[PDB]
Subunit: 258 residues, 4 copies
């Protein structure tokens, strides 16, 4: 199986990388960063994010592995010490796969993006106001700092800081949270909302048509936007699992105590 | 088809009830409150709740209808004005059915209950402290006023007042929220948590073994409790649908504007 | 100066107590638990609370000292290791005093109480509903689990768990927070409210006239209540200060890191 | 007494303005927008804000009046219908004055600003990280979207949307709230904080030294910032009062029902 490895860039990560590669040379494993079947990232959740988006157009042909050379991550959940064993197990190709849901974002003026964590919307400076439309029915007029639509695995990220709920990744859904909404004229739901597959959430400008849109780490000022559409993606990300590391165990280690 | 009708008890509801019954006598429809196939409640969401628990041991053999003689409800979503048309449409038995997930609560000292909205736990006076265990792994030690586990349709109820998220009822899940947790010694997740089918959440006493437990409207002081177990029920509640009244439309009418 | 000492009841605290007493016998200091001028409590914030209420009718004639034989407290902010030095410094009577504001609670059917932390209101089971009246003007009708009125120093307690703000004790004020308020029929402010001296907040029953009222640690089911009145007390609690332990330093050590 | 009048710019406000001026010509009242003693703004709270900052260097020599030609404001609390009576009462100079506290913001690289509502800090894009220092003691390291320091009267504004408490303007204080703080590495207080006069809160860069700073409506990207200092201003804003419109009455009308 073809494979490739990305590194955070620091000494510890490049060294760990050149080692796994070496240990990989001891097996039938060709290195290939154009058409890999295995993508290993070494660093943190951020390093994993970039690895995802580098190959987001081949998701169905790749199994991702994430190693953390620092504190435990939610995607980088394997310690460096377990590196040599990752190499061997990946060699047999016996491993099982696990898939997490993704979020499709559409922008019309038409652009499409895939989010592993979330996509957010804010104003280009000045007041942020958008009509919120769910499955073609007007739901509310939002006034505040912005909004956030998150994947299940992305709930432990930005979503969490916004009062969103943590959702188990086996649930195919997306969750919308509010940023500093004004409530008085305007009236928002306040609560976070969790949508199932096929539900389409759409945002529409009331005055300003320029928004700062983000998809995971990349953030662009889109001009003359007419509509932003959110829906659970048909596509999924595929991880290779070699042992049991329960999502809630990962939540606990991360937020309660490790 | 056998049927029965419950009423909030006020004049408007008893009159509406005796009318539907009359209009039902114009069809092949036997009234039966022991083995009904159709259960109509007239009043509010509360009147619907009681109707549910009166027949909770026959859920798979009943289709529920809820009429609101006051403000729109989430289960009582049909206006009195549409009564006569309900009667006719129910007569043909052509109607489609829609199912919402329920919550199974287990209490060991062993008692089992079904919740349409939620189940909560509080102390019998004095400090409330419980160990929270998810799928057999200890997740956190909770200290505060109590906890709340909610069904999808129950998210617009108590859950909502506790910062929980609103979840679409087509998602088979349960959501746990915190009540006034202390954070300093103790450390809780803070965020609400959304669990999929088959996940088992368990609460265990640390000192006091007496808790005030609630399942929907009924609330009992259970003594010498050893464990409380929450999991998505295998059983579902079945509604008869005669037209499109989207859950989010029901959320909007209820909280934003009607 | 006459003095007395209370102890949490455990070995460590009784031993520390009998020591300070001994060291006190080395000075002109008569032990007196009826008319003391110095009240030392040994244990935690709870032990301090009880010491306060034991002598709440002599506040202006007493200076309180709080020692923590466990984790740092907000009132028990002196370590056992500093005991012997407390004894000496208290002997000279040179020490300066520091006063924190208190909360006056009034109950009419007429009873008055003093709170060092807060006073809360909940229903005697069944739904809790009260009209909230500020300075004689109706402000809102509250529906939920209950309400909480807190002193400045009490803000780091229950108040904090309810989303209240932490207020510096030199500010003469009281803060009201909500418990799980329903928002839809009913409409509450949501935000916590901070009132200055002389503002009178009053709660009035809408149906049920029985409430579970708490003042700090003591909690009584009051029957046939007609009104509950909150206002900043004219009376203050007096601490003896021997060195600088800034409130915010105490907040930091307690919640961020010690 | 010299006076001047500002208008939102719409027809209704300019007409109301030219009228009051006319009615003012019927008295001994010279119009002067350079050295006025009375400043009347006509529009909304925003129109009042601009009027404040236009003359912020003469606060002690001016009494402000705010008229709302739309929905009730917190500073624009007089209806157009009461215009002619404002004119007469202001003519006698008998009116009483009322003062609200302000917030002093200091920026070092040194710039000083006055806020009627609040001052906020955010990153110039990229992650926002600042050390929070209270009265020279390090309190916490903040990681998130930003922070907000609010005056008492400003609590009903941005502060409110951030979970801050509403504070009565007679209390000389400032309140700090968090924007989407991450909690896991980093650890923040979470709670809002209310500081008394003389307390100095300081923010300091950890990496990036560029921040988007706002003072009320104006928002500037400051570069190479070394410190931002917040403290209750010595200066106060002075309103002319002609009758009783209680702050809490203004809170109620605005958020509960008018
Ligand atoms: N593991 C904690 C660190 O990883 C970043 N992070 C990313 Br990128 N995605 C997530 C994520 N999905 N959950 C938690 N943290 C995440 C998060 O911003 C923090 O810096
Ligand atoms: N920049 C990489 C990641 O940072 C996460 N994030 C952002 Br952006 N802002 C916040 C934030 N304020 N709190 C927690 N996580 C955040 C967000 O999940 C994104 O994928
Ligand atoms: N329709 C609003 C009214 O119905 C009660 N209620 C019940 Br009972 N269940 C729900 C529910 N699931 N969602 C919203 N409100 C509910 C809720 O407590 C309120 O009194
Ligand atoms: N008593 C009937 C219903 O009341 C709902 N409920 C309760 Br109990 N307390 C609250 C509450 N505090 N806020 C909102 N809903 C609530 C809860 O959903 C329950 O099913
Ligand atoms: N010091 C933390 C411990 O002391 C209790 N406590 C009391 Br009693 N009063 C306060 C208080 N005012 N602030 C913080 N904790 C308090 C609080 O409930 C916790 O058990
Ligand atoms: N029982 C002694 C003290 O406990 C505090 N308290 C209570 Br009661 N409930 C909570 C709570 N749920 N969270 C934090 N503090 C609390 C409250 O401040 C009281 O003075
Ligand atoms: N009266 C409500 C309107 O006035 C704006 N506003 C301003 Br500007 N300052 C305040 C303020 N201090 N309180 C409430 N709203 C305010 C607030 O942003 C909203 O647009
Ligand atoms: N722009 C004029 C006023 O708007 C207020 N404000 C801002 Br900026 N953002 C928000 C916001 N997100 N919610 C409520 N008020 C806000 C803030 O109080 C400021 O003085």
């Amino acid at each position: 199986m073809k494979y490739m490895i990305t590194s955070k860039g620091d000494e510890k990560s490049d060294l760990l990388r050149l080692n796994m590669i070496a240990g990989f040379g001891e097996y039938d494993m060709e290195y290939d960063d154009v058409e890999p079947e295995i993508v290993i990232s070494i660093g943190g959740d951020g390093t994993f994010l970039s690895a995802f988006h580098q190959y987001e157009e081949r998701l169905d042909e790749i199994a991702f592995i994430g190693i953390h050379t620092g504190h435990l991550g939610f995607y980088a959940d394997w310690r460096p010490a377990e590196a040599d064993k990752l190499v061997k197990l990946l060699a047999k190709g016996e491993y099982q796969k696990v898939s997490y849901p993704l979020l499709k974002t559409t922008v019309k003026y038409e652009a499409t993006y895939l989010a592993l964590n979330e996509s957010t919307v804010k104003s280009s400076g000045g007041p942020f106001v958008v009509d919120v439309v769910i499955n073609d029915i007007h739901f509310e007029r939002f006034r505040g700092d912005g909004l956030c639509m998150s994947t299940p695995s992305g709930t432990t990220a930005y979503n969490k800081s916004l009062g969103g709920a943590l959702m188990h990744p086996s649930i195919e859904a997306m969750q919308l949270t509010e940023m500093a909404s004004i409530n008085n004229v305007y009236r928002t739901i306040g609560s976070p909302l969790v949508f199932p597959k096929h539900h389409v959430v759409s945002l529409q400008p009331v005055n300003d048509k320029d928004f700062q849109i983000s998809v995971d780490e990349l953030s662009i000022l889109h001009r003359d936007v007419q509509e932003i559409r959110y829906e659970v993606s048909a596509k999924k990300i595929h991880f290779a699992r070699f042992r049991s590391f329960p999502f809630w165990r990962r939540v606990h280690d991360s937020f309660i105590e490790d």
